[PDB]
Amino acid sequence: AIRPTIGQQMETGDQRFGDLVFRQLAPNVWQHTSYLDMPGFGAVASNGLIVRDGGRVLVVDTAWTDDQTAQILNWIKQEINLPVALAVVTHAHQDKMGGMDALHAAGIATYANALSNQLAPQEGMVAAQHSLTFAANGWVEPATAPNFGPLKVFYPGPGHTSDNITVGIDGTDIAFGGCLIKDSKAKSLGNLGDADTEHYAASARAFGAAFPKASMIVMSHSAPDSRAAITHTARMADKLR
Numbered sequence: 001a002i003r004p005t006i007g008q009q010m011e012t013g014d015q016r017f018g019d020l021v022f023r024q025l026a027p028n029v030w031q032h033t034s035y036l037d038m039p040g041f042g043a044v045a046s047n048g049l050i051v052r053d054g055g056r057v058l059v060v061d062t063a064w065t066d067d068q069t070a071q072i073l074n075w076i077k078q079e080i081n082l083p084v085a086l087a088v089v090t091h092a093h094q095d096k097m098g099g100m101d102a103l104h105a106a107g108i109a110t111y112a113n114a115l116s117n118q119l120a121p122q123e124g125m126v127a128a129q130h131s132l133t134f135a136a137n138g139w140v141e142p143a144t145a146p147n148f149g150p151l152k153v154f155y156p157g158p159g160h161t162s163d164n165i166t167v168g169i170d171g172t173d174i175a176f177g178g179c180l181i182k183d184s185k186a187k188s189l190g191n192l193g194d195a196d197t198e199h200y201a202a203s204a205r206a207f208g209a210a211f212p213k214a215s216m217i218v219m220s221h222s223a224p225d226s227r228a229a230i231t232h233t234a235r236m237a238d239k240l241r
């Protein structure tokens with residue numbers, strides 16, 4: 001078993017594949033987990049999603065590294081055996097965009113918030129090949145998200161970072177909050193170094209309101225949780241103002 005310093009531990013049902021862990025969340029949704037070994041600190045787990053949409057697969061977030069991301073693609077090849085149509089990455093930090101090069105090498109179309117793409121070079125990341133833009137209420141402009149199938153992308157406002165986006169999985173009760181949302185028992189909001197402390201609470205609540213019927217909330221650094229992850233995150237964020 002992989003036993004990270006930060007992130008959910010392994011439980012029955014989890015599948016180890018190389019350096020990664022996969023968990024099935026729904027008949028057509030899996031969580032991918034990759035681990036950054038921080039020298040002297042141990043492993044930091046990061047989670048994304050894999051969604052089957054008929055004869056194709058859609059990915060949310062890379063792994064920390066290109067090699068780990070290539071392993072995700074290998075797992076998809078083995079277990080699903082369908083092509084990856086596109087990937088969405090949820091902001092311009094290593095845990096979410098560290099593996100862009102592996103996606104590009106594989107010929108997978110990549111999408112991110114326009115702002116994430118603009119920040120990427122300043123964060124030592126490679127930009128996605130396509131930019132998503134958003135309405136004044138946070139919903140993605142549909143023309144910028146062509147053929148996204150069940151992925152419903154929502155920009156909740158600045159929180160964990162100014163560019164953080166979130167993704168609901170239509171046809172399921174799952175929504176993905178990325179690094180914006182922390183678990184219902186969290187002691188902290190993680191790294192606030194790039195955070196908007198004024199708007200964080202409202203942004204967390206906006207995510208909840210965008211996907212009001214989602215009962216399983218997936219996030220970057222803990223196991224899937226209830227909507228209490230959203231409300232607890234917002235309550236922690238209320239204290240920052």
Ligand SMILES: CC1(C)S[C@H]([C@H](NC(=O)[C@H](N)c2ccccc2)C(=O)O)N[C@H]1C(=O)O
Pocket residue numbers: 036038044093094095179189190191192220221
């Ligand atoms: C897990 C984190 C505390 S670190 C990660 C991210 N940081 C990185 O991706 C850095 N490249 C990094 C540097 C040293 C050790 C780990 C990550 C961030 O600052 O939001 N996301 C944070 C978070 O989601 O709260």
Ligand SMILES: [Mn+2]
Pocket residue numbers: 091093160161179
């Ligand atoms: Mn981050």
Ligand SMILES: [Mn+2]
Pocket residue numbers: 095179220221
């Ligand atoms: Mn993170």
Ligand SMILES: [Mn+2]
Pocket residue numbers: 198199
């Ligand atoms: Mn402001």
